[PDB]
Symmetry: C2
Amino acid sequence: PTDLYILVSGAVDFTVYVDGHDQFQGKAVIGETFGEVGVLYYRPQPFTVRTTELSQILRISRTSLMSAMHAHADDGRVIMNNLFMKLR
Amino acid sequence: PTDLYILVSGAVDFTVYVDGHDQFQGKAVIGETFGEVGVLYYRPQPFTVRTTELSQILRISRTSLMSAMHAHADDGRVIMNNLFMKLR
């Protein structure tokens, strides 16, 4: 992983790559972020990400996140949102 | 702060020290831990801790906790329990 990809517009279609020959599932809509695996898990992305109609995608990359790490006492809220986010 | 104090038996009475001349509130019962401020907050303890009847108190100290930190992928559950613990 290298960067966060917040959508601002445009549809996104995710399909299984190598493990899955065709079909499967993958989605993200306007405002719905992805790339939240490689926040601190430092692990590769699960799916493939192919666009359908054109989009505008912000990019707060990995080193920019880790530079934002020293601004603490509010990263606890982010990490609580991560834990309650993935457990549900 | 220096150590965690898990009760195993015995009552504990906590009263305000210096800021409060008398009364106030402070409690912990069999099994109910305290010292959970100085987990990662690295901040001094709020209350005073005076025993009432004798007790048996375990002690997993600060350096022992920080030695337990490298055993990861299950400290996330501890930190989620911290965040959902204090926010309620």
